Amino acid sequence: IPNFEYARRLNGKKVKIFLRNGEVLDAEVTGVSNYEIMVKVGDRNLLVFKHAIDTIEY
Amino acid sequence: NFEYARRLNGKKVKIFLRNGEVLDAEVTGVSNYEIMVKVGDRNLLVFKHAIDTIEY
Amino acid sequence: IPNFEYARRLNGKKVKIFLRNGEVLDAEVTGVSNYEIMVKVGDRNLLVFKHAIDTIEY
Amino acid sequence: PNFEYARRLNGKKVKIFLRNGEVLDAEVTGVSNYEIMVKVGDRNLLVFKHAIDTIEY
Amino acid sequence: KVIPNFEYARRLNGKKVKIFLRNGEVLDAEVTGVSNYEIMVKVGDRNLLVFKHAIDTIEY
Amino acid sequence: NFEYARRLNGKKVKIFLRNGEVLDAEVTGVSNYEIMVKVGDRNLLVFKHAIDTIEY
Numbered sequence: 001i002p003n004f005e006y007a008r009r010l011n012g013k014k015v016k017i018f019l020r021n022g023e024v025l026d027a028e029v030t031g032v033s034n035y036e037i038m039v040k041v042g043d044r045n046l047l048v049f050k051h052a053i054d055t056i057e058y
Numbered sequence: 059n060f061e062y063a064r065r066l067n068g069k070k071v072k073i074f075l076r077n078g079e080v081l082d083a084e085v086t087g088v089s090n091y092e093i094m095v096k097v098g099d100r101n102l103l104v105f106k107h108a109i110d111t112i113e114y
Numbered sequence: 115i116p117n118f119e120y121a122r123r124l125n126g127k128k129v130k131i132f133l134r135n136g137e138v139l140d141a142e143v144t145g146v147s148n149y150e151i152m153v154k155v156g157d158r159n160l161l162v163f164k165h166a167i168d169t170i171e172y
Numbered sequence: 173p174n175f176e177y178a179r180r181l182n183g184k185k186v187k188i189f190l191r192n193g194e195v196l197d198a199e200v201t202g203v204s205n206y207e208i209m210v211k212v213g214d215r216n217l218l219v220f221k222h223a224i225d226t227i228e229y
Numbered sequence: 230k231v232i233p234n235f236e237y238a239r240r241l242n243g244k245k246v247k248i249f250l251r252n253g254e255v256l257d258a259e260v261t262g263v264s265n266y267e268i269m270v271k272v273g274d275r276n277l278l279v280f281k282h283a284i285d286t287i288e289y
Numbered sequence: 290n291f292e293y294a295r296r297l298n299g300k301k302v303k304i305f306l307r308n309g310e311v312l313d314a315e316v317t318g319v320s321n322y323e324i325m326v327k328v329g330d331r332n333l334l335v336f337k338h339a340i341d342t343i344e345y
């Protein structure tokens with residue numbers, strides 16, 4: 001388990017999450033754990049596994 | 059090692075799998091690497107590595 | 115809680131293993147380690163890496 | 173635990189089903205935590221375990 | 230480990246590189262940070278967090 | 290932990306990547322997660338997770 005990750009400072013930000021299948025989420029980040037990012041996308045709440053993310057634009 | 063996935067135990071969720079399948083699931087258990095679910099009359103062990111997103 | 119997993123509880127059971135490539139194994143589980151599942155499928159003996167498994171129906 | 177079922181395969185003839193759909197008719201010559209060393213035909217290969225789906229033995 | 234284990238990627242911090250992602254994209258990138266799990270880059274006028282698991286190769 | 294990959298340093302090898310590309314490579318360094326190579330007139334950092342097999 002890493003002690004430092006840049007993903008932590010994404011909390012509360014509006015970002016673009018590029019998923020490994022080619023979909024993109026216009027997301028607001030509501031939580032970050034070592035392996036998950038929690039987001040709101042429109043009216044949906046999602047848990048996103050980091051392993052399913054390629055890049056995040058912020 | 060805090061995880062949000064553990065908060066989902068007992069809840070109805072939609073699990074989006076890496077192959078494109080979507081599970082209309084009730085979460086029955088969560089471990090470090092697995093999520094146990096009921097889907098219809100099926101009982102499944104789902105590996106987290108095979109999950110992309112979960113809608114809850 | 116260290117090393118707790120549900121997969122080892124499938125030991126000795128008949129299960130359906132859904133592999134990441136879309137193949138499905140009608141399997142009898144004979145052993146479970148941290149990263150591997152040992153199974154019998156018909157007359158074949160297989161080592162299945164957990165990373166290659168999507169779901170197991172039991 | 174310091175246990176791997178893959179270690180049972182050392183020195184054995186096996187079929188390795190890779191994630192890309194290829195199958196290796198392999199003789200296992202070594203097993204590390206992350207790799208399986210094999211002879212296939214006249215070739216020596218390092219096979220990463222993460223690229224393996226199943227092994228028939 | 231507070232002092233990182235050796236990795237070649239940290240030598241690329243501050244450099245211009247081409248990152249080849251698993252999805253077939255190439256990023257013309259300036260590396261601005263490296264963690265255990267991520268590589269931070271500037272691409273055009275975009276700021277990206279790139280997960281190492283999504284990278285195949287880096288040409289430098 | 291033991292890595293067979295360390296033994297490949299300085300050798301000419303064929304690296305079969307997960308996307309189907311094949312690198313005709315000279316290995317110039319090996320770390321826990323990376324293999325550094327020369328291919329043509331290019332220098333590449335290759336993540337081990339992107340490699341399927343290496344012929345050597």
Ligand SMILES: Nc1ncnc2c1ncn2[C@@H]1O[C@H](COP(=O)(O)O)[C@@H](O)[C@H]1O
Nearest residue numbers: 001035049051059061089090091106107
């Ligand atoms: N220590 C942990 N605690 C909780 N979940 C984990 C842990 N390690 C890995 N995971 C999850 O399991 C997936 C597969 O693990 P790995 O094969 O180690 O990458 C990860 O991408 C996470 O979603």
Ligand SMILES: Nc1ncnc2c1ncn2[C@@H]1O[C@H](COP(=O)(O)O)[C@@H](O)[C@H]1O
Nearest residue numbers: 051234236264265266281282322336338
């Ligand atoms: N402690 C670490 N030091 C350097 N790179 C790492 C470390 N942990 C993970 N990585 C990289 O991040 C990738 C993530 O894969 P995984 O750990 O399997 O989710 C690995 O394949 C490595 O390239």
Ligand SMILES: [Cl-]
Nearest residue numbers: 239242262263
């Ligand atoms: Cl650095």
Ligand code: NA
Nearest residue numbers: 002003004230
């Ligand atoms: Na650390």
